[PDB]
DNA sequence: GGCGACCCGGCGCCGCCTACGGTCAGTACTACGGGTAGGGGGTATCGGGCAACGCGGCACTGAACACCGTTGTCATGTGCCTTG
């Protein structure tokens, strides 16, 4: 968590230093943007101990999510030609990130 | 003011080996952009199958000499007959 706060803040910093009053709103509409970015990029890069590229990554959270869709909605495990389907991609692939998206254990 | 309690921290330990043990965890997104390791073809260099060309024993063209062996040969010596 705390990890994540400084992130925030060298995102804030950035921020900052791309701000201008042009802008006709608050500061919590625009640094709240590079905020996310800074954080999504730390969470990204630094989270997984076999580091993964971020392109990747966001292929494991979006196959997390929608598989997760699949389980709220179906109520059943889906089979993986219907996964490849709503991804899109061929089950090979499927097999392969979700492979790629385990952890390390102690 | 140093003692004194007490108070707390603070640690530190709590005995030796042996069989097997069962599993799973939630809230971005796109977009570009470079740059590649992999997909291809064509070329230069090194790495295989048949003959290569030696050698050597001996062996023959026997040729040309050598080594005994031999009956060629013979000008020159004994024995009998005729005459001094």
Redesign the pocket.
């Known amino acids: 968590f705390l990890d994540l706060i400084q992130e925030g803040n060298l995102g804030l910093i950035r921020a900052v230093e791309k701000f201008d009053y042009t802008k006709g709103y608050k500061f919590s509409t625009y640094a709240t943007?590079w905020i996310?970015?800074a954080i999504?990029r730390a969470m990204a890069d630094q989270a997984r101990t076999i580091r993964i590229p971020?392109?990747m990554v966001?292929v494991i959270?979006?196959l997390?999510?929608v598989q997760?869709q699949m389980l709220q909605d179906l109520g059943r495990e889906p089979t993986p030609e219907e996964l490849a389907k709503e991804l899109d991609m061929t089950p090979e692939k499927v097999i392969e990130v979700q492979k790629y998206g385990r952890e390390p254990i102690s």
């Open positions: 943007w996310r970015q999504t971020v392109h966001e959270n979006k997390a999510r997760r």
